C-alpha cells in the first residue's frame, strides 16, 4: 500500500494506490548416487560366509 | 594485440572464406522479398533496353 501527497495546484488529485501480486514457487531437484560391487552385495547378505 | 602481446594482423586476404563463397551471388530472397507491394513507374530510362 502506498502513501500519497495531498497537492495544491493544477496537478491532478491523487488516489491511494493499493497493490496485489503473487509469485510462483520454482522447483529443482538434487541427485547423488553410489554403487555396490557384486562381490560386496554377495557379502552384505549372507551368501559367502 | 592478441592475448599475450603477440601483435597480430587481420588483412583483407582473411575475408576470402567469406566473400569468395557463392553466398555472395545469391539474391533471390532480396528481389523476391522486396517485390511485394508493387512500386511506382520510374521513368525506366536507364532501366530499359
Amino acid at each position: 500500500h502506498q502513501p500519497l501527497i495531498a497537492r495544491d495546484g493544477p496537478h491532478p488529485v491523487e488516489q491511494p494506490v493499493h497493490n496485489y501480486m503473487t509469485k510462483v514457487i520454482d522447483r529443482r531437484a538434487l541427485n547423488a548416487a553410489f554403487s555396490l560391487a557384486t562381490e560386496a552385495i554377495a557379502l552384505l547378505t549372507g551368501e559367502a560366509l | 594485440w592478441g592475448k599475450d602481446h603477440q601483435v597480430l594482423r587481420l588483412s583483407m586476404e582473411n575475408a576470402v572464406g567469406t566473400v569468395c563463397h557463392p553466398s555472395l551471388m545469391n539474391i533471390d530472397a532480396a528481389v523476391g522479398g522486396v517485390n511485394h507491394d508493387p512500386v511506382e513507374a520510374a521513368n525506366p530510362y536507364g532501366a530499359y533496353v
Binding site: 495544491d8 493544477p10 491532478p12 488529485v13 | -
Partner: protein, 299 residues
C-alpha cells in the same frame, strides 16, 4: 450541481472586485472540470493558441472544446461556476443573464463568441491582475445559427464586392447587426478566417462532385438513379459551373478524403449545439435583455 470554485488571484483593486460582482450569471468556459481552478485558466488570455488571440473561428473551436459553466455566486477570493455539461439533463436550474434578444420561455440558448456583436463591448478588463474576460452571448439556437450564417455571407460579399443582411427583425423591434463605424472592419477581420474555410469548403465541394459525377456513372444502379432525380439540378449545375470554370480519379479520391474531413469539422464548429434550454415557472416567460433567466441543462 457540482460547483467548481475558481480562485481569484492576489489583491485586486476595489473597482475590479466590483467588476466581478457584476459578472454573476455569465457563462465561463473552464478547460477541465477540476474542482479547484485558477482565474488565469478561464481568462481570455488563456485562449491564445498560435501565439495570437483567437479569431471568431479560433474561439468557436475552443467553445466546443472546454466546458461552459454559468457563474452562480461570485465571492471575494472565489468564483463559483457550475458546469453546464455535468449532471442529469433537465436539472440544476441556474440563472443566466440575457444579452440582446429576449430569450423566450424556451429555445435552447447557444453561447456564441462575443465579436458577432459589439466587439470589445463585454471584454470586462481587470487591470489589477492584468487579465480579461469575454463572455459569450446567450442567443437562441434558431437565431444564433441565422446570425452566424448571416455574417459569413456578408463576409463573402465583402471578400469581393463592387439587400441588407444586417437588418434583423426579431420579436418586437428590428434588431441591428451593423454597429457601422469600423466595428464592421473589426467584425469582418475576425470572421476573415471563418469566411475562407466556408468559401473553400464550398468551392472544394462542388468542383469535387462536379468532377466525380461525370467521372462516375460511366464505370449500374448508380448511373440510372443518380441522373434520375438529378435531372436539371446536378447536371445543369455541372454544365453551368464547368462553363465558368475549368474541369483524375487518383487525386480525386485523395482529395475527396481531405475535403470530407474538413467539411464535417466545419459542421461541428458551426451549428452551435445548444448548451441549455430555458424552462421558466412563476416567471415572466420572456426574459428581457439584461435580466437573469432560468435555464436547464439539456435542450
Amino acid at each position: 450541481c457540482f460547483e467548481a470554485d475558481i480562485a481569484i488571484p492576489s489583491g485586486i483593486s476595489r473597482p475590479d472586485a466590483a467588476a466581478l460582482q457584476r459578472c454573476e450569471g455569465r457563462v465561463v468556459f473552464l478547460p477541465t472540470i477540476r474542482r479547484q481552478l485558477a482565474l488565469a485558466d478561464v481568462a481570455h488570455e488563456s485562449f491564445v493558441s498560435g501565439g495570437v488571440s483567437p479569431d471568431t473561428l479560433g474561439l468557436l473551436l475552443a467553445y466546443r472544446r472546454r466546458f461552459p459553466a454559468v457563474i452562480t455566486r461570485v465571492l471575494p477570493t472565489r468564483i463559483v461556476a457550475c458546469p453546464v455539461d455535468l449532471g442529469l439533463t433537465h436539472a440544476g436550474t441556474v440563472n443566466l443573464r440575457n444579452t440582446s434578444p429576449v430569450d423566450l420561455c424556451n429555445g435552447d440558448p447557444v453561447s456564441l463568441v462575443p465579436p458577432v456583436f459589439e466587439g470589445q463591448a463585454t471584454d470586462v478588463r481587470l487591470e489589477s491582475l492584468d487579465l480579461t474576460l469575454r463572455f459569450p452571448v446567450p442567443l437562441p439556437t434558431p437565431l444564433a445559427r441565422e446570425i452566424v450564417a448571416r455574417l459569413v455571407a456578408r463576409g463573402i460579399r465583402d471578400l469581393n464586392p463592387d439587400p441588407d443582411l444586417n437588418v434583423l427583425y426579431y420579436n418586437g423591434a428590428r434588431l441591428s447587426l451593423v454597429a457601422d463605424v469600423q466595428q464592421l472592419a473589426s467584425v469582418n477581420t475576425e470572421l476573415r478566417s471563418l469566411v475562407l474555410n466556408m468559401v473553400y469548403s464550398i468551392t472544394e465541394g462542388t468542383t469535387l462532385i462536379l468532377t466525380l459525377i461525370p467521372r462516375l456513372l460511366a464505370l449500374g444502379y448508380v448511373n440510372a438513379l443518380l441522373q434520375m432525380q438529378s435531372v436539371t439540378r446536378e447536371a445543369a449545375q455541372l454544365i453551368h459551373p464547368e462553363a465558368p470554370m475549368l474541369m483524375r480519379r487518383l487525386p480525386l479520391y485523395e482529395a475527396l478524403v481531405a475535403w470530407l474531413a474538413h467539411a464535417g469539422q466545419l459542421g461541428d464548429i458551426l451549428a452551435l449545439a445548444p448548451a441549455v434550454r430555458v424552462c421558466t415557472f412563476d416567471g415572466a416567460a420572456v426574459v428581457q435583455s439584461g435580466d437573469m433567466a432560468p435555464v436547464i441543462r439539456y435542450p
